[PDB]
Structures are given as C-alpha cells and as structure tokens.
C-alpha cells in the first residue's frame, strides 16, 4: 500500500511541497508495483521517478540562481551525486526481482527524507524572506 506517508515535518515552500509530495507518490507507486511483483511496472515507475527527481532538482537549482542562494553550489553537487546513485540503482532493476526493488526503495526513502528535512530545509527561510512561494 503506502511505504512513505507525507508528514508536515517535510513541509517547505508551497511550490516545493507539491514536488516533494509528487516524489513521495512515485515512491509509493514503485513500492506497490514491488508488492504486486510487477517488474515491468517497477522499471517504468522508477524511470519516471528518476526523471521527475532530476526536474525537481532543476527547479530548486533555478531558485538558487534567481535568488543568489549562498549554498547553491554545494546543494547542486548533492543533487548531482544522488542522480548518479539513482542511475546506478536503475541498472540493478533490469535483472532484479521484487526483492531488489525493496532494497532500492529503502535507499530512495533513506535519501529523500534526509535530504528534504536536512538539505532542502536550509533554503526555506532564505527564499520565503525574498518572497518565493
Ligand atoms: Ca560519474
Ligand atoms: Cl528532494
């Protein structure tokens, strides 16, 4: 059913919430496909999750650029490394079974929750103060 439930703990800027909430929906879509043992759906969902994550990162990075956020550089490198990691995980799915999918999801969750609560939260005050929403 649901692997990760959204919490007010993850809240940030309103437009950022809609995106993180979407990433969470993808994690839940992927988990469900694993529960069903449907590896084709899993690979499909994973691909879209990855792609969306990349666009989400780009949106955040555009905000960093537009509002001259002092930590744009480091945050960008953080996003950059996760993408490589995701691309790596992606390969494990070709021959993987529902089991490997569960390991991946736990990895995805592990990274996503930590990143949102620890990394993305750093930019909230800074951007709200400059009228971003
Ligand atoms: Ca590389
Ligand atoms: Cl994120």
Ligand number, closest to the Cα atom of 88: 1
Domain tally for the chain?
1
The residue range of the domain holding 35 is: 1-133
- Cα(84) to centroid(ligand 1), Å: 6
DSSP states along 52-114: HHHHHHHHHHHHHHHTT-TTHHHHHHHHHHHHHHHHHHHHHHHS--HHHHHHHHHHHHHHHHH
Burial 42-79 (b: 16+ CB within 10 A, else e): bbebbeebbeebeebbeebbebbeebebeebeebbebb
Query: 106: domain CATH number?
Result: 1.20.120.50
Does 84 count as an annotated binding residue?
yes
This structure was determined by X-ray
Report CA-CA distances (Å) from 47 to 6, 60, 100: 22, 20, 15
Resolution of this model in Å is 2.1
Ligand number, closest to the Cα atom of 83: 1
Is residue 27 within 8 Å of 105, Cβ to Cβ?
A: yes
Contacts by 109-116 with C-beta closer than 8 Å and gap 24+? 109/3, 109/4, 109/27, 111/82, 111/85, 112/4, 112/20, 112/23, 112/24, 112/27, 113/4, 113/10, 115/78, 115/82, 116/10, 116/12, 116/20
């Amino acid at each position: 059913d649901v692997l990760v439930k959204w919490s007010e703990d993850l809240a940030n800027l309103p437009s950022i919430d809609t995106q993180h909430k979407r990433l969470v929906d993808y994690i839940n879509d992927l988990y469900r496909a694993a529960r069903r043992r449907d590896m084709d759906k899993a690979r499909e969902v994973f691909d879209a999750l990855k792609n969306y994550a990349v666009e989400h990162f780009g949106y955040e990075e555009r905000l960093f650029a537009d509002y001259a956020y002092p930590e744009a550089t480091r945050h960008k490198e953080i996003h950059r490394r996760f993408v490589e990691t995701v691309l790596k995980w992606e390969k494990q799915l070709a021959a993987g079974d529902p089991e490997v999918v569960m390991t991946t999801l736990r990895g995805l969750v592990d990274w996503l929750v930590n990143h949102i609560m620890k990394e993305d939260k750093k930019y909230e005050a800074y951007l709200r103060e400059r009228g971003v929403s």
